[PDB]
Amino acid sequence: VLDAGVFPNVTNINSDKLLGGLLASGFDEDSCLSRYQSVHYRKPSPYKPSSYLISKLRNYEKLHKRCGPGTESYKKALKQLDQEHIDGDGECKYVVWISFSGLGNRILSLASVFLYALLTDRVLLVDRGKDMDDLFCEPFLGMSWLLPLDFPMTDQFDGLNQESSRCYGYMVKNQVITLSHLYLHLVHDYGDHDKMFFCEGDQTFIGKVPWLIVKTDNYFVPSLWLIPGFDDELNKLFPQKATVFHHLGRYLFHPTNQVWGLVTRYYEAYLSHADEKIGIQVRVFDEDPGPFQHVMDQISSCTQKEKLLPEVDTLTPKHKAVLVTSLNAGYAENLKSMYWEYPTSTGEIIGVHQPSQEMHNGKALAEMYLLSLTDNLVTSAWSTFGYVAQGLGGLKPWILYRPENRTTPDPSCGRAMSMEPCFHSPPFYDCKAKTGIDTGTLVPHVRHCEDISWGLKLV
Amino acid sequence: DKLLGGLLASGFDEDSCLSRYQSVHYRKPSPYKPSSYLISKLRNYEKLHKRCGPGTESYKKALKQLDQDGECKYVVWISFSGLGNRILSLASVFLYALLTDRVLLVDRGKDMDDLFCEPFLGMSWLLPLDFPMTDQFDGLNQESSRCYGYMVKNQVIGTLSHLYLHLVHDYGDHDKMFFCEGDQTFIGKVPWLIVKTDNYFVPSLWLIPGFDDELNKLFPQKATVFHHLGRYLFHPTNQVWGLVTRYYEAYLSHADEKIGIQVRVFDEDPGPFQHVMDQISSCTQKEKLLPEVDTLVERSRTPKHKAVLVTSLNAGYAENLKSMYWEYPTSTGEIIGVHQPSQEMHNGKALAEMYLLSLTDNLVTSAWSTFGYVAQGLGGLKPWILYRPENRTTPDPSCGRAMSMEPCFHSPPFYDCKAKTGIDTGTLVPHVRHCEDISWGLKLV
Ligand SMILES: [Cl-]
């Protein structure tokens, strides 16, 4: 009575439950509820992953299977770490990400190192730090992405930096230069020699080294597109160039059951009956504690001038829910008051909701996910919290420009160029001519960010 | 049924007071039906009011009587104390008018006509601003010469043209003589009564011979006094009604069930207090009002949505409930949302919040709080009462069901008019008992 055959729960591998083929089927459902449920809470993305990307991800998983932690190839590769140089090609190459910086930085920078692994046929290993395995499920079918806790160099991670004799930028400075491993300082404070990571010739050298250790707090994807060789491959992986983090972030990052219960209970209690949901991600960079009136004006001005929220009259509708995230409750409270106190000019019903005000990282992650479930999103300038949320949702946000001198900016916001995050500390260096250059004005699809003019983003 | 089983008269202008009839779309129908005798009493009141009300010829002529056996008698309610007290003590004075065939006139204070529509079809209930004793209202107290207690004391007791009745909580044994039958017979001849009170004094009227027989006919269900008279008298203005409908629509209208938690803490420190948070979780859980949460990884196998409407000056109690229902799954699978309208348009919002609490299915209230008495009475809700803590210790048991939906009278007289001696007026008849929350109060049951 063998009837998988005639009635297989056969799955379209490009179903919306698998995000159009981005995700593999076959994971254990129970141990990561969020993985295949993103569909019950979100709308399907209009941005479809390319067949080339899908095959690249299926084949990465093959590589991760063969070379992943605890495999015999992994244990054999570890032995190269014992000597300073190697006697021939191992079968497996690695890039290890050190858990460093805030949660927004870690999501974006881990997405960047993963793209890099894809571009260099390396296996990604993840330093779990204090919490990575409490926040996120396993993303690679059949294997773990976590660095083993007995990895020999883990106790060096914290102290690795620019003057470490293994730092690639250190070696370049002191004109010293196959190595068994190499540390890449890619933290935002890195310098000219560290930035040589983004040169074609240096990547040829680095490509030979079996183990790379990366410390980074930046979304450095953009500058990868200005590297000969990588450019052709990226062009094929992402026909729509500003979908990099939308695809890789959705592929890599799935909240654990503990975090996902925060998302689903909040959505089901507070958000699920609205016809439309507006996200307002508020971040105020300022030592003083808010809330600030000029920021409240900025928010009112932005959402009303863009027709996101109705004006009120101080003198069968649709129901719109507003999800506000912020350290200070004051902005949400002010919106909540206004729409309680006065009728809307349009007749629309407006509800205002904020999850939390100042399990901390699990709530932060839940709130990024909740924002990613909204229909239209307003973000804060310079906020990686917003970049994560906009990217997971495929949302081209409206950006609340950074105020100067506590004056409401005019315009208070404007539409982003694309949904992509911003790379805050890009190199400005022409590798071929060996000279300074404006990397925001080389190619049409790499521009300076709307919100931090030094930075670069994909458009 | 917009007319609440005959309690309300048809024919008001709808658009000028949307709440009057449009509130049928926001509450369940009340199971308590006004007696036929009450309905007649109210229609005939409205006739009396049309005939004697402000701006009539009969009013102008009665005014002249104050300058020193006519056909119009009145009782004037002075706007005094907080909103809760005002609503309850106004309902009490209206009952008194019904019992003594008087016209009720309302001193509008700073805000009464900003908060409430006109209750009496085709006349106004507001005292005219040019009423001649208005400037005296503030000063009137137990030392006024026309204070009834001040006359029982000096023994100064023709028919007087007017009398002031001191019925504030600080009144004394001579003031309290108002609640005796013989004093009522004297007071009953005076054409103008002025009352200042902050108490719900209804239950003691049931202990006065003569009033007792009438009250029995008006309210065969004795504990419906405030529920019927309060829904008859108090209709939020369009301004206030918009606070109600907007909040209801945005936050409460999709729930299968609504729980009101009316939090008032009588303390110097603003709080919040963990002993009060513990009282609330314990009360709502032990009474099956809200579900328990739990810490099990393995979950058991659609869910009802409950909205919890919390009112309090401080946001901390609602924030504590909201966090707990965010951070942990419910043991029942039920979906819990927690909502608080405001934290420290003040009186407008106060009235709307009382009105929203009256919209819930089950209600928790705070001991001693007239804010909660108004909510429960308008809603026809018999509450669970969070008892008043002592020494910042969570009461045990944390709460109990009220005996009835009626408010409590905080400052009753304790006096046998006939034997001319003190007595416990909470032990005379079975329908007037000591309150659950304040042991020397009285309430109807
Ligand atoms: Cl180069």
Curated annotation (Swiss-Prot), chain A:
It holds the Pfam family XG_FTase. Keywords: Cell wall biogenesis/degradation, Glycoprotein, Glycosyltransferase, Golgi apparatus, Membrane, Signal-anchor, Transferase, Transmembrane, Transmembrane helix. It is a single-pass type II membrane protein. Expressed in roots, stems, leaves, flowers, siliques and seedlings. Disulfide bonds: none annotated. It is found in: Golgi apparatus, Golgi stack membrane; Golgi apparatus membrane. Its main location: Golgi. InterPro entries: XG_FTase (IPR004938). One of its GO terms (biological process) is xyloglucan biosynthetic process. One of its GO terms (cellular component) is Golgi apparatus. Glycans are attached at N9, N405. Residues 1-459 are lumenal. Its EC number is 2.4.1.-. It comes from the Eukaryota. GO terms for molecular function: fucosyltransferase activity; galactoside 2-alpha-L-fucosyltransferase activity; protein homodimerization activity. Involved in cell wall biosynthesis. Is both necessary and sufficient for the addition of the terminal fucosyl residue on xyloglucan side chains, but is not involved in the fucosylation of other cell wall components. Associates with other xyloglucan-synthesizing enzymes to form multiprotein complexes for xyloglucan synthesis in the Golgi. Homodimer. Interacts with MUR3, XLT2, XXT2 and XXT5. Belongs to the glycosyltransferase 37 family. This is Galactoside 2-alpha-L-fucosyltransferase. The gene is FUT1.
